[PDB]
Structure formats: C-alpha cells, structure tokens
Amino acid sequence: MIVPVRCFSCGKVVGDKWESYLNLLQEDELDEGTALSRLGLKRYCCRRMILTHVDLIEKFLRYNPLE
Amino acid sequence: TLKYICAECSSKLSLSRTDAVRCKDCGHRILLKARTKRLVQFEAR
Amino acid sequence: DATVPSGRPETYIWRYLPAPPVCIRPSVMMQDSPASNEDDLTVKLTEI
C-alpha cells in the first residue's frame, strides 16, 4: 500500500521521503542510485524500503464507492 | 441514522422495511450498509 | 452336527428373514429439505 512509516530492520522513519524521492525524479531527471543518497539514506537496509516499494494506493483509490 | 447507500449512484436510501430492495435515482439493485457513528476502541500496535 | 434345535439343514435357505433395528440403519436427516434422506437399506427391505 503506502510507504511504511519506519524501516523494518534498523528503525528510522521513512514517511517524509516518498514524495521527495519522486520529486527528485519528475523534475531533474536523476539516477535512482544517486537520488536517495543525497536524500539521507546511507546504509543498505533503508534503501530497499524505497527501491522496492510497490505503491498500490494510487490504483485502489480509483474504485471509490462515491462516483 | 444514515441508512443504506447505493453501489455506484451512492445515494443514501432509508427504505421502509418489507417494501422494496432497489434504489431511487438509478435502477441498480445492490445496497451497501453505511458505517455506524458509534465509537470503536482499537489499540495501536 | 445334530443335538441343537437349529442343526437341521432346512434352515440354510430363506424362509423367514429378520429385520434389523433402526439403530443400524438410521434415518439420517440431511436437512437439504423438510424431507428425509432415507438410506438405501430400508428401501431394499420395502421392495422385498
């Protein structure tokens, strides 16, 4: 669904970086590797949380019961 | 109160009981019960 | 052998047959209907 508010293995928060990591891709077309190092995710246990996050919340919402 | 709603018309229907099972404004025949107002008590873990 | 009442060879073909209790052949209610799914053992005993 939506990005998990904390990392699974270490514990730091990743909820304020999903919109940032995308905004570092729409404008200023940039590598996926060098984006989330500038953003502040050093070790390799936080970088899997945003590399591999499938975001199914944008496709579930189009089936809302309110027309 | 805030009774039954429709599927895609999404119009709040308070049908009198043992009369009908359709909705107005649209011919659709599926009526979803809307959520209560009553408080419900969860944990946060 | 002889010396018992039922020791004749006359009692080895059906002339009377007994009917079992209904504890053996119980009328199981499947409740797919208000009708009873009667087992196959009584409907043979009625066609006799």
């Binding site: - | 107005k24 404004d25 011919g27 | -």
Partner: protein, 127 residues
C-alpha cells in the same frame, strides 16, 4: 394411489411448463400445487380440460403474491378466449371457499411495462 401419484407427476409438468414460459419464479409453482392438490380431492378436475384448470389454479397463486401478471397472458398461449378461462376461474373461487384475496391494483402494472417497452435510459421519471 399409484394412479393418483401418476396423475400429479403429469400435472407437475404442466405447472412447470407455463412457469418457465412466463418467467414465473420457482416459489410460486410450489405454492400453486397445494391449490391444485385440494382442488384435486374435491372433484373439481373431473370433466374439465386438464390444461384449462392448471392456469386458473396458477393465477390464484399469482394474485396472492401481488405480481404484475395479468390473466390474458395465460390464455394467449392457449389460444382460447379470455372469457373461457375466466369462467372456470369464477367456479373455482366461490366453490372452494377462497374468501380473502388481493385486489387487482393497477399501480403494479406501470413499473413492469417500461422494461420491455425499450424507452429512454431515464426510465425513472416516466415512472
């Protein structure tokens, strides 16, 4: 009897025949048979036509439900007059002591006319 079982096994094909045709749902055919069953014992089926009593018996079950079905939709398949099958309906109801009965409410018939009439998709404002 075996002949009395065989005269309703045949008479069960008749009620399921017309109910498949007029889209009568299955909770009326089974409700219709007891009206045929009490009229069977009380000497009402003798003499009259087999296919003329079962549609008159079915209309009793369709009136009690208060459904949109008329009386002439039974007769037009049978290609007889309305007044032929209607006359043996009157000799059923007063003979077999049917006192309570729904009235032919005409407000039922408006809602069913529109769907096979193929009118516009704003079919609620016409209703």
């Amino acid at each position: 009897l075996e002949s009395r079982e065989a005269t309703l096994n045949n008479a069960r094909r008749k009620l399921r025949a017309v109910s498949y045709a007029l889209h009568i749902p299955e909770y009326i055919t089974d409700a219709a048979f007891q009206w045929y069953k009490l009229a069977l014992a009380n000497n009402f089926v003798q003499g009259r036509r087999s296919q003329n009593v079962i549609a008159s018996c079915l209309y009793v079950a369709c009136r009690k439900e208060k459904t949109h079905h008329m009386l002439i939709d039974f007769s037009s398949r049978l290609q007889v007059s309305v007044y032929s099958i209607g006359a043996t309906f009157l000799k059923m109801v007063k003979k077999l002591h049917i006192t309570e009965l729904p009235l032919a409410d005409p407000s039922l018939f408006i809602q069913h006319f529109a769907e096979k009439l193929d009118l516009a998709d704003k079919k609620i404002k016409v209703v």
